[PDB]
A = this chain, B = another copy of it.
């Protein structure tokens, strides 16, 4: 559907829900916040997190990530 939840996004990136949480928080990434505080990432947001993954897999430190 439109968006997925942290769990779905983490299983697809092969990372942990915790990691997803740290990335969004630390990187100030824009995602929709659910009425209960749950992260809601759209197909477009994933593209962002997908990038964060690739960049990280190149020695790039999370603080030094460009978006």
Contacts and interface: CB of A to CB of B under 8 A. Distances in A.
Contacts of A37: 33-38
Interface in A25-62: 33-38
Interface residues of A, number: 15
Nearest to A17: B16
Contact of A16 (B7, B33, B36): B7
A37 B37 CA distance: 4
A37 B36 CA distance: 4
Nearest to A33: B35
Contacts of A16: 6-7, 17
Interface of A: 6-7, 10-11, 14-18, 33-38
